[PDB]
Ligand binder design. Structure first.
Ligand SMILES: C[C@@]1(c2cc(NC(=O)c3ccc(Cl)cn3)ccc2F)CCSC(N)=N1
Ligand code: NA
Length: 381
């Protein structure tokens, strides 16, 4: 407990492509890079020679493979995957020194799922059974890990960000060198997604003055598998209005705020200080008590390096409207060390020791604050 040197720096990735960890599947072990996803619950790996893939699960080479003789079809809002369910021995080279029999969805057909140019071949769904496909009987990997070993029912993520991103996934523990100050915990409202309740929203300290139910319509989640801070449409509308006002020194086209176009500045001449901080107050552990997390423009203005039609420093506005509730994606998580404390049904936030900042402002986790009617901020029906 407290320090896990061998798990430090076990995450890699590229900007806009997510964070992956090294895993082994089968006997003898087949090495795969696997996307770390707190927004889903399936362990699903490429099992066929899709041209975008560096490598894939070859079930014929594994003596420990077992067929569940069951298919699974997973459509998303944009794209799909389809696979054949089985079990095999799963290990994490730069994680705990254990081997687990886990459910594996062997991906045999997909559309807009794998990324052309990416270095990962599967997805580690770290959320709960309730949202597993096809149903809650298909035990998620981390549930299997805890059930079969003495690994504590907790993991933590330090996503570092801005061409190669890095970070740490501490399995079964917390590493105190990864954060500064104190951890503050928000209750997991329900174990399906990592669902949380946002009780107050500020832009540069200015409250948005909305019914706090709107902040969590229809849910708020912490999701390492999403880049953006995604806000419910009505919240997004009001947040951008306030961000527009706060950043009035320079004017930008309407399309930039909708993520329909990028904005470019000359190298090193990026004006961070004209852009406001964004604060989310989260439900605390105690009745009427809350805490505040605060991110910088460094988090919500993402560098886009892939532009060929431009030679400057171009950025995407990575706060976007949503119809699925608040998604606290990489835009949030890159500022913080995030502790998914499953044993105690809570999520901890602390200032990340690796987060990107200037000399005038840092990301912050602050409390305690007094907030009434926090239970009424959650959505029902
Ligand atoms: C299963 C799903 C998903 C996520 C991804 N993520 C990424 O590619 C990515 C990219 C950048 C960053 Cl920072 C993080 N992640 C890719 C394919 C997917 F099917 C469905 C959509 S939402 C979610 N939480 N999981
Ligand atoms: Na997708």
């Amino acid at each position: 407990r407290g320090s896990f040197v061998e798990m430090v720096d076990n995450l890699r990735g590229k900007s806009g492509q997510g964070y992956y960890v090294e895993m082994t599947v089968g006997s003898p072990p087949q090495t795969l890079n696997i996307l770390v996803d707190t927004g889903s619950s399936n362990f699903a790996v490429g099992a066929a020679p899709h041209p975008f893939l560096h490598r894939y699960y070859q079930r014929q080479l594994s003596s420990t493979y077992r067929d569940l003789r069951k298919g699974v079809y997973v459509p998303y809002t944009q794209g799909k995957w389809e696979g054949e369910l089985g079990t095999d021995l799963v290990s994490i080279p730069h994680g705990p020194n254990v081997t687990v029999r886990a459910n594996i969805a062997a991906i045999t057909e997909s559309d807009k799922f794998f990324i052309n140019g990416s270095n990962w071949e599967g997805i580690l769904g770290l959320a709960y059974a309730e949202i597993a496909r096809p149903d809650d009987s298909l035990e998620p990997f981390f549930d299997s890990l805890v059930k079969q070993t003495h690994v504590p029912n907790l993991f933590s993520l330090q996503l570092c960000g801005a061409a190669s991103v890095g970070g740490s996934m501490i399995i079964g523990g917390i590493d105190h060198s990864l954060y500064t100050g104190s951890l503050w915990y928000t209750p997991i409202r329900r174990e399906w997604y990592y669902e949380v309740i946002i009780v107050r929203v500020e832009i540069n300290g200015q409250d948005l003055k909305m019914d706090c139910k709107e902040y969590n319509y229809d849910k708020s989640i912490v999701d390492s598998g999403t880049t953006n801070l995604r806000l419910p449409k009505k919240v997004f509308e009001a947040a951008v209005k306030s961000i527009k006002a706060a950043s009035s020194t320079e004017k930008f086209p309407d399309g930039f705020w909708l993520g329909e176009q990028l904005v470019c500045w000359q190298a090193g001449t990026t004006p961070w200080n004209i852009f406001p901080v964004i604060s989310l107050y989260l439900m605390g552990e105690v009745t009427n008590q809350s805490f505040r997390i605060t991110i910088l423009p460094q988090q919500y203005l993402r560098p886009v390096e892939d532009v060929a039609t431009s030679q400057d420093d171009c950025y995407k506005f990575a706060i976007s409207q949503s119809s699925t509730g608040t998604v606290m994606g990489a835009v949030i998580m890159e500022g913080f060390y995030v502790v998914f404390d499953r044993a105690r049904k809570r999520i901890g936030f602390a200032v990340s020791a690796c987060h990107v900042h200037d000399e005038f402002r840092t990301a912050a986790v602050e409390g305690p604050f007094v907030t009434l009617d926090m239970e009424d901020c959650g959505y029902n029906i």
